[PDB]
Design a protein around this nucleic acid. Sequence first.
RNA 1: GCCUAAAAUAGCUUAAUGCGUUGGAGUAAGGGUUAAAUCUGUAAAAACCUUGCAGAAAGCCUUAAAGUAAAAGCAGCUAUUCAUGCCCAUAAAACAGUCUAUAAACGAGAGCUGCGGUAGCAAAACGGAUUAGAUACCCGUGUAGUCCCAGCCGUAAAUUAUUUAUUAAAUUAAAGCGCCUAGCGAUAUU
Lengths: 54, 75, 119, 112, 116, 31, 90, 306
Amino acid sequence: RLIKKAENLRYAMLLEESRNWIDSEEELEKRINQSLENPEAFGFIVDLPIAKGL
Amino acid sequence: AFVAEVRDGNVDAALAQVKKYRKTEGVNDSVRKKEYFLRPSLQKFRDSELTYAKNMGKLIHERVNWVVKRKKIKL
Amino acid sequence: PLYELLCLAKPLGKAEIAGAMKIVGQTVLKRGGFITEVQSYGEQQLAYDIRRPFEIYPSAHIFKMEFAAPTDIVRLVTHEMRVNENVLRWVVVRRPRFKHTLQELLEEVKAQENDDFKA
Amino acid sequence: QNAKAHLVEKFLGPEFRPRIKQLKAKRLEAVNDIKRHEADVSSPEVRVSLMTYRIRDSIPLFDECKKELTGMRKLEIMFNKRRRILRGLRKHNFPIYSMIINKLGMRDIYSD
Amino acid sequence: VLQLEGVVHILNTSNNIVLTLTDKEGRVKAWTTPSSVGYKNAKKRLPVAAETAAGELAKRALALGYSTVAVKIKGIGTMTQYAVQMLSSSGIKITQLVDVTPVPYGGCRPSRKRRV
Amino acid sequence: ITTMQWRKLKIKKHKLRKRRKANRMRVVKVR
Amino acid sequence: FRPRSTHQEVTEMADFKNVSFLTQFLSPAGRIQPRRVTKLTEPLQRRIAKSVKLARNMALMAGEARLDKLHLTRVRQEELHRYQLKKSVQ
Amino acid sequence: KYTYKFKQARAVPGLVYWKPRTPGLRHKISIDYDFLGVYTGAPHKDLSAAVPKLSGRNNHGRITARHRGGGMKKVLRQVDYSREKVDGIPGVVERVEKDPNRSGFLALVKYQPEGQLPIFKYHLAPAEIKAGDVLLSGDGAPVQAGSTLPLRSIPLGTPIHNLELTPGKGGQLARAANVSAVIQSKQLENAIVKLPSGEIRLINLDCRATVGRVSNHLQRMINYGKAGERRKLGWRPSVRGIAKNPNDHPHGGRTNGGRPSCTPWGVYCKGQRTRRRNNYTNKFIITRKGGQPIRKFAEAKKLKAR
RNA sequence: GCCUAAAAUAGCUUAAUGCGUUGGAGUAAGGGUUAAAUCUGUAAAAACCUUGCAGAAAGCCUUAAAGUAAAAGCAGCUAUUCAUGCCCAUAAAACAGUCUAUAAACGAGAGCUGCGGUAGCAAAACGGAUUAGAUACCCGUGUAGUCCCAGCCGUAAAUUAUUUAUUAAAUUAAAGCGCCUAGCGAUAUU
Ligand SMILES: [K+]
Ligand SMILES: [K+]
Ligand SMILES: [K+]
Ligand SMILES: [K+]
Ligand SMILES: [Mg+2]
Ligand SMILES: [Mg+2]
């Protein structure tokens, strides 16, 4: 019973993350342009947050 | 690549640093390995001899250290 | 699974960089995946210069992309990087599927029930 | 921006998973008819069925990769083990032996 | 004229010592070796031969106008100590010592061992 | 097996190998 | 006394991209230090070594000190100053 | 090198190992076209022509190419080595056929231009193209086997074949079975290309080539078991020089090889060079076969004269 | 969910080295020995700064192997396929054993056939020395081989006999086998 509740908890969190996911080319072009216009610093200066999953 | 700056013309001091870098950073070990080739079975025996010599030196100075600690010998 | 791509490209204009990034994105979308993160770090100076048959590159433009797709996407992305001549070097690394383990989720559920039980 | 539930379902589903994981999921579903109860994963009926399904899925695998000798040796070991399990069932419990043969379409050649 | 900065390359590989004088761009101006001074097959391994070669190179370096030099050493040997000291005592100022001995990351197979 | 036992076998193996090589390129093998 | 990172920090930041972080486990000549000096567990020792090796493949690190790249220390400090100023202004 | 153990093993797929029933079948090894899916029937009617055999005779009626004639009927196929006509239109492969006039395989491709009738063409089959595949050429095509692109859009390490020396004349360089060429570097207006023979040459960047190799990897495993097998192909026997009489060959006399080996016209044939020392094309050759620099070849007798 | 000196498959990185390699600068040696010489150069070498091409191998981590991969064996990076190992949570009312007469598979290095490749090292071979002789040890060149793919060969000083109980080991008593009966001596016959 608790495992089933845990599965539902994971599903709820992923829905919030999905708001910023891109699956259409129109969003892809906008994301690429924004990224190029606002460069970030690399690991030579500041430590970067390493991705752990979704 | 080790760079040793010479201060006040003390060339001997710079030479001492160069020797230290070679021993600490393993340059003498690479030269020894590449002088000639030994089979992996013969390289194993060579490593055993070197470690044995190191252990004997460690044992000898372990005895001396105990004498100094107990009898306060000024060597 | 979840993959991350790090690409070192020549320090060209924005339009050329955008084109290289768009090729990878469409490959992922076509196969049936989606993209989570797109970032760029600008031009960076490398530890040593990358040498081509008659060229030397002491710096490069670096960008990263994170995406989820079937296991067959790795070969498709590798092919695109090799074909494109504006890309100097690339690497693809797999990442963990989930941020939270099953044990961590169970502890959160148990804590919530204890609060309700106390209430 | 709105949430994309259809993307969450794909990620949680078997689509973005290695081939072996997808095959193993199908094997468990194929034994839903002969298992003793909803959580039986160790009865002799279930164990023999899973071994048989693994053999069938491995035949195409080794037709392409003919040099993976380690995998073949593991398969050969399981092949002999399943024979001795069926030999024991026939001698001691015929009714269970009959069901396994009928379900998997085997032949009664497991005597001594 | 005398405001010239140069580089001295010392190569020592267990049988001979080679000293080469170059500018800061890599162009060679002079070079010396124990055989060029008078020491031959078996006598080239003596510390005296290394000192004489170092002294001769210093004389040519001063004539060309190189008073300040940097020394780059390649290899492990005993002759480098004497050559460097002779250059310093000959009137040439040494500003830096650099070790550039290579280290293979794997590499090629060396020759067999001598069963002497 | 001891070193002495190895050496005793060594001589006989050498003699057999030498004879086989001689007969390798002969019409009628010497036996 | 020298700074030491916690094992929790290592597991969270042990990546080939964080060259600055990975520098703490390299000798002044640029070689990998043994586990008896780093004071790390076996799983953490392996991760650090692989991160350094991968960074070398991508030209983010050099296998040894290079004489032709001695100005990078100046470059990194100049970049660091600009980044701090930009963020402070923002 | 053929060995009798190779035929006994009978291992390589795609070959017909004829059982030694007769003296003429003991050493015979052929190709099994059915097992490979290669069509071995008549050629397309609109892309072929029947022609008489020449047997190595020119318009003066005299033999200029020796040891030819006496084979089977000859039919020729028209092959489009340059696909500039159909740049944009994609093509679908219908069949892979065998041609006795070449060592590779040909592919029959159908194009369907918009507003026109279907078009059929013959192409040199790439290594890994089968019936039903799609071939594309011109700008905007992927870098995959069977695609034809200019040298400006091909990676360095990708093997290529059917390369053009001139911009639009057609592919001429790499055609034989299981051969390819590679690009080493690209300069301002030329690319350095290594040919199948090991020669490094300069080729203009506007030339085109096909990605992949040629489509026959069993050419060197063939063994003709009979004299008559090559007679049917159109080859006639030849006689050794030392067997003739003095008035026929320089080796004619009773003694064997009284003088160094040479051609029937007296030219040394065990190392003498025949390329012109001052050939105009020396400006495009960097290294000749075997590693000889071009300057070494161009200036070799001038130094001896000096 | 993660890990892996496990296997198969496919991409990628270069410290050093070699050259009938490019350009600049420069001029007598380089290489080697107990001591010498053959050899490579002065018609422009080695050494120094640069250019091109190529093969093999994987510094520090790195240590046993503590993986034990069944044995043979196994650590440059990344990914796929597959098999293990770790944590956390589950599952079986009847089934699963030890050993091997006989039979099969896997199997270092060397060697054989075909195809591709050939830097370094190196049987054979050819020279220079040492010596009463040197047919060896030493020095200079150097082909097969070592490398890739597909086949053949099935041999090593190719680990401690296997299993149950006890045991840190050990020791004690049992279950199923293989081998030995003084040495010496065959290319016996099949
Ligand atoms: K003839
Ligand atoms: K004659
Ligand atoms: K073997
Ligand atoms: K060797
Ligand atoms: Mg006659
Ligand atoms: Mg062993």
